[PDB]
Design a protein around this ligand. Structure first.
Ligand SMILES: Nc1ncnc2c1ncn2[C@@H]1O[C@H](COP(=O)(O)OP(=O)(O)OP(O)(O)=S)[C@@H](O)[C@H]1O
Ligand SMILES: Nc1ncnc2c1ncn2[C@@H]1O[C@H](COP(=O)(O)OP(=O)(O)OP(O)(O)=S)[C@@H](O)[C@H]1O
Ligand SMILES: Nc1ncnc2c1ncn2[C@@H]1O[C@H](COP(=O)(O)OP(=O)(O)OP(O)(O)=S)[C@@H](O)[C@H]1O
Ligand SMILES: [Mg+2]
Ligand SMILES: [Mg+2]
Ligand SMILES: [Mg+2]
Ligand SMILES: [Zn+2]
Ligand SMILES: [Zn+2]
Ligand SMILES: [Zn+2]
Ligand SMILES: [Zn+2]
Lengths: 32, 364, 343, 334, 367, 360
């Protein structure tokens, strides 16, 4: 796995990824 | 005025008593056969008729006609006992009188023979509140009781009493009143009271009673007061809704269907009234756990959640288990992270948003 | 010092009356029956005066000594009763009892009630002083194996007929509570004058099933009866049974199950039951669990039990009922997500 | 209350201040159990209460010395938990404070000794603050504790801290060898297990603690190859569980250090056990098991009424599960 | 001299702020003559439960008659204002939680009122009563004498038994909003002839949550600190609230992954002795507000309009994942703040950690 | 007989106090304008002068000359209050008077007029220890005190107090003194006492004070007693650590290099010499923070540390910041769990063993 991901796992910090982006109602502008 | 239904409808006869057949039949058989014991104890939940049955037994014991299970209700003794002015019947509130000195004076009256009754009946209520010295005095009295006295005890915490006291008395445990019996009793009471009612209102009141007749009568009185002297389905439904406040279940349902606007509206509604956000999260976690248990086995859901049985069953049948597990894990993480959030409301909103639209990335 | 059981107390009293009687045990019903029999026999012999005192640090031994020394003009043949502390007599109580035994008279009939005395308590000057002129009756609750015999005898002396199924139901419903069982028998006799107590009658009587029996829930779990276990847990929750008691009972049973599961990989289950002195009636249901749950189960269950016990010891939360229901489904063959087990 | 040889230097300092009058009215002694701090406090109290001091020691013949020897000195106060209790209540502190207001019977200094400040309750500690801040003239307070951090910050700030240290390792080893007859490796291991504090190792040797340690080592040696850690329950389920858990944690730490490479190990008397532990277990699993053992020991020592058997069984099952491949190990976190 | 919270206690229904539904219901009941014998009031602290109960008592016991608009000038009204009215029995259930007191009170309910037409019992903090006390009030509460009325006020209604809740009419007051609190403060200060600024009043209203008692206490404290004036600087010093512009600039610098600006801001904050924990709380609040704005355009409030546009820009630039990562990092930093050697050191290390794991511009990797 | 510096140097005038400028200014303005409240509460950490400020306010209120913010200090009332034997100033120790009966008895006597002073001042200390019944009993009278009484409250944990009590009094929060302020106050006290001192000793004492001036004075008194009546850098460094400055650098370097042998040898030497482990952990955390700071900007390195610059810069240039953050987190976790470990050395060794694993 990625080094940064492993370091975050060792730090106990969880990473959240979008699953249903259509739920959000607004100009998120995630893409660029 | 119109009096209170509970006060005006104290069971004055064994037939009027609702349920509790295993106790009434045994008492009637004992009275008919003459097998009467010195000490009787009654145990059960609130509003199950322990005091009423004790009073009925006391009335039957000292009736002019004789020791019968069906008091006449017309002789002077019956009238005095009903009015509570009977000389030979001594009613004691142990909660109010707990010190040994107060109980000793009452217990010393056993020396005098009955004045106008066959037996000198003592009815002690809330006996579990007596002190250690009071219990010792009662045990001393009960060790060698006079043949012409009887003791009746009623309490909701029999375990508090000493084992010695329990061992020297016959104990009867009272059950709940089910639902149909409560509905029939309420229907009869309202018919006698000349108060308009509807079957649906009676069914809802019986369901909300939860096995307690006193609670059912209190709810009926509340409906009458709010209904302006009339019992109606709309009045009872509004009364129950005022005591429901089902924002948590609505939030869970909105989240499961991914409806952010409903979630925000419910959050605002909950914030309108004073509520604990951590308590709300705990309730949501419990609801999700119950849904998962029901999915594993239909028998998980019991009669305690009969009010929201249909909604829970629908959620269990519809939602796949994986979504329930994901939401439960997300709510656990949210509860863990809540203390250090900028605000409880902000933490709850963030966690609900994460459950709605975000998926965590597990290691490996 | 004679040693007897409650059944032989009546025969001993018929044979003769001794100076002192000791009632040591943990069964209030048998102790009360023995006390009533002894007092009735004494009253028949001419003991119309009775005195009872409670032994405690704040005790007025002067009154007892004065009563022992003082005579009576007409009301002679005194009877004295003592109630020992639950913990048992201490050195001060030991010397007080020795002094009381020193001041004994033929007209004074002494009775003592308390818990079973240990070797240190037994080896006391007052205890040895009464050795030659005392009879001790052992009064303790019989185990489930000996329970049905006692139930049958009690029904027989009441002139009642009990079926085998009815006896088993009564033992199951009122295990460890003889007072409640006797009261239930009396109520059944009152209900049915004919005295025929068939299984349907007791089953209708069992409809009460008041509370205090979480062992029923644990047995339902052990039997794999998910529906029965869930129903009993719901009834207990409605009854407000102490969740800590349920946790402790399930903890004992689960520790025994875990030990059996771990050590049965090289030994038969029945041999391990014999080693642990398990009761054959239990051995069945336990075995079912040991033949129904893998090693992965009874480990997640142990984790959940330990977490719940720690939470109740530190947080005292009242949501323990939901955790108990989750552990109930875990103890069954339900897979469970393992996330609700906080794993 | 033995007067250990290593208490001579520190005393010679403290009493010297009292000879010059530059003595703090509140002294807090930090020392491990068995270091003899009680003897030092008793010597200081005897010196202070002597009516005719000579040099750095009490005369032993004046009225004060006779009363102290008899143990009925009116101006000497001791605060200790009751025989049946394990904590010091606030009533004792309040009554002592009230009694301190009046003048001394002998017209001299008044000495109050607290057996252990760590056992003080919150209410007692808060109440004692005013008394300790501005005590009456010719009044001295002595307190002893193991972990000053556990004491209340406000109470701590009002005391002068004096810290004792263990003697050199060679001196402690020689003293133990003189006191008891045991192998040098065993003596060194016992001394290290006691943080280098003499007397604690003597307590371990005189009692059956050494036999229990040997049994635990044998059980662990049997369990590590097979991997059945549940059998250790019988070796761990006891009233002295924290000590055995500490021993197991020390063994795991020694094995991990040996794997990493070290010249000094706490358990020098059992090279084989630590070697087997290092060979058969990976560093990550060793660290996880060590953390779990420490956490369980802390829970047992902290939680009141906690069941020992359930926690030990859960810990053993958790360790066995972690031993399986493909199991995510715990990670320490805030 | 006198405390504002007390000097400005409402004395008429027109003086009550908000709670329109409860006042309308009470007025309709008084006008139609349909008066219940048991009322319960619920809500958060400092909303006017006791004030509304006292106004209802005045209306019921006014000399003129049963009206929804008490005169406020007759002897009954003045005595109720001064708390010396005999027929208004005020009970502090918090202190008298024992059953004997309840029995003593119940033993004297059939006696007629001394001077008024009704005997009104106002029980405060009724939730603190014992179970026996609750059970003892059921019968009398359900059948009060014709000249007896019961008023109940509590902050924790759910503690009461369902039986007690079934013998009264429930009114649930709601927490006041920022606009109402600010308007009330403006009116009070204008009546008191005290200088004020809009930003100071907005900050006071926001820091008072939804309780007017807290808002008035904060206003008094600011006046004491401000030396007879209410200035934005004085209110900021009293609340210890760092400028929101500084927090927004720090957040923007952290996003831009330019640590020099971050350290310059840290030094500037340390120059004025800005609280570090407050800074972390403000940053977390700003991040959460940005996340909410991303969730919904209308989430942002009016009080932040001065920076609204700026925040909106972030809502159109920062992916939600980056916002969540920054929020989690700051939350962990706050978790570890107490154990850091210094609060300044802890915050600096937290910011360095956030910069190191920046999704777009991580710190350079060593060769 | 002999009095410690803390008791001897209790401020007796508003100008003799250190810091808390806002509180003093507010009190002076209130007294000058005549707007005097009937309930004052003081909150803050320990040893910040809450009691001293309350006593100064009490002296000002009851001074014979009049209600002024600058008490004369020479009239009978001022001397009596300073010596703690003033009749109309009643000081209550709530830590030992938590009983509601005592509170009721105290309130029953409020109706009586003051004996000598123009006001009857009640100074309740450690009010947070009072019971709920005591607070409820106080509430009513605190809401309407007579015109001739005043209430002063000092507290260190205001959170425990109910909101009702808080809303009935004017609250003043005291800011913890800065390191520079503590150092300046200690220097002034020593100069007034004519005691030799060095800047480094004062810096170390202020740093060890941790925002408490009472603790700083206690440490200064201990150093004076143990240093033959003189404050010196060597004596303070003996009473404290500070010898871990170079040792901590070597330890962190060994940890970064992932050399177990060297780390264990250094730990054994540290245990043999008998240093404090908490100080070692704090120094390691500070060094890691400084290394992380230098990576962002070379100029961030402090000039006072111009002795190990080469090693610090080498570490900063050689180690990625992520590893530095990981090590900082590990050290913080170890520090948090240090008191809960069986031994300090055992916990430190556990933390270092965990840290060593972070190396490919
Ligand atoms: N079995 C019953 N049949 C009919 N009405 C009942 C029955 N049990 C209770 N009620 C009603 O509930 C009222 C109160 O019943 P009680 O006998 O006082 O309750 P309880 O069992 O005595 O509860 P406790 O012992 O006071 S806690 C009666 O006046 C009836 O209106
Ligand atoms: N709606 C309102 N309109 C005007 N002033 C109000 C309002 N709500 C609160 N206040 C003020 O805040 C004070 C709060 O008085 P309280 O008698 O405590 O009201 P309360 O809601 O009963 O508070 P609790 O619940 O007992 S803490 C009032 O005396 C007013 O000065
Ligand atoms: N602001 C200050 N100015 C000057 N000296 C101070 C100050 N704060 C504390 N001190 C010193 O520390 C001693 C104790 O201060 P206190 O008045 O007790 O502060 P405190 O906040 O009341 O402490 P508590 O709350 O009682 S533990 C004083 O006698 C001074 O020597
Ligand atoms: Mg009843
Ligand atoms: Mg109020
Ligand atoms: Mg103070
Ligand atoms: Zn009749
Ligand atoms: Zn001497
Ligand atoms: Zn009017
Ligand atoms: Zn003056």
């Amino acid at each position: 796995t990625s080094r940064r991901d492993w370091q975050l796992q060792q730090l106990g910090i969880t990473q959240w990824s979008l699953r249903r982006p259509g739920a959000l109602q607004g100009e998120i502008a995630i893409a660029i | 005025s119109y009096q209170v239904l509970a006060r005006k409808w104290r069971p004055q006869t064994f037939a009027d008593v609702v349920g509790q057949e295993h106790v009434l039949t045994a008492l009637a058989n004992g009275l008919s056969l003459g097998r009467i014991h010195h000490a009787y104890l009654f145990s059960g939940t609130r509003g199950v008729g322990k005091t009423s049955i004790a009073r009925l037994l006391a009335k039957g014991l000292n009736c002019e006609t004789g020791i019968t299970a069906t008091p006449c209700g017309v002789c002077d003794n019956c009238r005095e006992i009903e009015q509570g002015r009977f000389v030979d019947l001594i009613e004691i509130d142990a909660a109010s009188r707990t010190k040994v000195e107060d109980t000793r004076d009452l217990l010393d009256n056993v020396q005098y023979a009955p004045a106008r009754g066959r037996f000198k009946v003592y009815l002690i209520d809330e006996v579990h509140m007596l002190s250690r010295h009071s219990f010792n005095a009662l045990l001393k009295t009960l060790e060698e009781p006079p043949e012409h006295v009887k003791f009746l005890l009623a309490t909701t915490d029999p375990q508090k009493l000493p084992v010695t006291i329990l061992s020297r008395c016959l104990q009867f445990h009272l059950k709940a009143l089910d639902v149909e019996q409560i509905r029939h009793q309420l229907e009869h009471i309202l018919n006698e009271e000349h108060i308009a009612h509807e079957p649906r209102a009676l069914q809802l009141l019986a369901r909300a009673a939860e096995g307690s007749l006193r609670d059912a009568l209190s709810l009926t009185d509340q409906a009458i007061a709010s209904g302006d002297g009339q019992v109606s389905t709309q009045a009872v439904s509004a009364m129950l809704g005022t005591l429901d406040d089902d924002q948590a279940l609505s939030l869970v349902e909105a989240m499961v269907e991914a409806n952010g606007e409903r979630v925000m509206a419910l959050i605002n509604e909950a914030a309108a009234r004073g509520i604990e956000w951590e308590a709300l999260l705990v309730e949501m976690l419990g609801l999700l756990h119950r849904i998962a248990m029901v999915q594993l086995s239909p028998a998980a859901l019991g009669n305690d959640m009969a009010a929201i049985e249909l909604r829970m069953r629908e959620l269990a049948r519809t939602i796949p288990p994986t979504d329930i597990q994901l939401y439960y894990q997300t709510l656990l993480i949210g509860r863990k992270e809540l203390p250090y959030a900028p605000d409880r409301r902000m933490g709850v909103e963030m966690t609900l948003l994460r459950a709605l639209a975000f998926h965590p990335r597990m290691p490996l | 010092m004679i040693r007897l059981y409650p059944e032989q107390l009546r025969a001993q009293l018929n044979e003769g009356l001794r100076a002192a009687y000791l009632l040591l045990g943990n069964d209030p019903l048998l102790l009360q029956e023995s006390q009533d029999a002894v007092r009735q026999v004494a009253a028949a012999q001419g003991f119309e005066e009775h005195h009872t005192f409670s032994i405690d640090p704040n005790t007025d031994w002067n009154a007892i000594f004065s009563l022992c020394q003082a005579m009576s003009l007409f009301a002679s043949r005194q009877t004295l009763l003592l109630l020992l502390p639950e913990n048992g007599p201490n050195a001060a109580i030991n010397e007080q009892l020795l002094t009381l035994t020193g001041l004994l008279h033929d007209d004074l009939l002494l009775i003592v009630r308390g818990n079973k005395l240990s070797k240190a308590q037994e080896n006391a000057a007052w205890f040895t002083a009464l050795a030659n002129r005392s009879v001790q009756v052992t009064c303790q609750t019989p185990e489930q194996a000996q329970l049905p015999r006692w139930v049958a005898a009690r029904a027989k002396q009441l002139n009642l007929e009990l079926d085998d199924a009815a006896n088993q139901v009564l033992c199951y419903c009122y295990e460890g509570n003889l007072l409640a069982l006797a009261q239930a028998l009396e109520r059944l006799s009152l209900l049915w004058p004919d005295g025929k107590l068939t299984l349907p009658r007791v089953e209708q009587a069992v409809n009460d099933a008041a509370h205090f029996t979480p062992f029923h829930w644990v047995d339902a779990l052990l039997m794999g009866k998910s529906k029965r276990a869930l129903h009993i847990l719901q009834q207990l929750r409605l009854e407000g049974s102490e969740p800590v008691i349920l946790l402790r009972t399930l903890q004992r049973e689960l520790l025994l199950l875990v030990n059996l599961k771990r050590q049965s990989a090289h030994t038969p289950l029945r041999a391990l039951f014999d080693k642990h002195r398990v009761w054959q009636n239990r051995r069945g249901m336990m075995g079912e669990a040991l033949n129904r749950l893998s090693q992965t189960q009874l480990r997640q269950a142990v984790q959940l039990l330990t977490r719940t016990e720690l939470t109740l010891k530190q947080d005292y939360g009242q949501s323990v009922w939901a955790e108990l229901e989750g552990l109930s489904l875990l103890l069954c063959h339900k897979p469970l997500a393992d996330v609700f087990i906080d794993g | 209350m033995r007067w250990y040889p290593w208490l001579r230097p520190d005393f010679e300092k403290l009493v010297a201040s009292y000879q010059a009058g530059r003595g703090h009215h509140a002294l807090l002694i930090q020392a491990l159990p068995g270091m003899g701090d009680d003897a030092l406090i008793y010597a200081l109290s005897r010196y202070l209460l002597c009516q005719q001091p000579q040099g750095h020691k009490s005369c032993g013949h004046c009225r004060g010395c006779q009363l102290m020897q008899a143990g009925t000195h009116p101006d000497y106060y001791t605060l200790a938990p009751e025989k049946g209790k394990n904590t010091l209540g606030v009533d004792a502190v309040r009554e002592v404070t009230e009694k301190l207001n009046e003048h001394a019977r002998l017209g001299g200094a008044k000495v109050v000794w607290v057996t252990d400040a760590a056992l003080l309750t919150d209410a007692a500690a808060n109440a004692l603050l005013k008394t300790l801040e501005e005590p009456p003239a010719e009044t001295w307070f002595f307190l002893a504790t193991r972990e000053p951090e556990r004491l209340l910050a406000t109470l701590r700030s009002r005391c002068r801290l004096h810290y004792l240290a263990p003697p050199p390792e060679q001196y402690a080893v020689t003293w133990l060898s003189r006191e008891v007859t045991m192998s040098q490796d065993a003596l060194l291991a016992a001394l290290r297990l006691s943080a280098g504090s003499p007397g604690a190792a003597l307590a371990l040797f005189q009692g059956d603690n050494w036999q229990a340690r040997e049994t635990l080592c044998q059980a662990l040696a049997y369990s590590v190859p097979s991997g059945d850690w549940y059998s250790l329950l019988a070796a761990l389920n006891h009233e002295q569980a924290p000590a055995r858990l500490h021993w197991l944690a020390t063994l795991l730490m020694d094995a991990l250090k040996r794997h990493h490479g070290a010249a000094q190990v706490t358990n020098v008397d059992v090279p084989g056990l630590v070697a087997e532990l290092a060979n058969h277990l990976s560093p990550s699993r060793l660290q996880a098991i060590l953390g779990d053992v420490c956490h369980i020991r802390e829970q047992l020592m902290s939680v009141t009424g906690i069941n020992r058997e359930l926690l030990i069984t859960d810990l053993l099952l958790r360790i066995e599960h972690y031993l399986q491949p493909g199991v995510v190990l715990p990670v320490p976190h805030l």
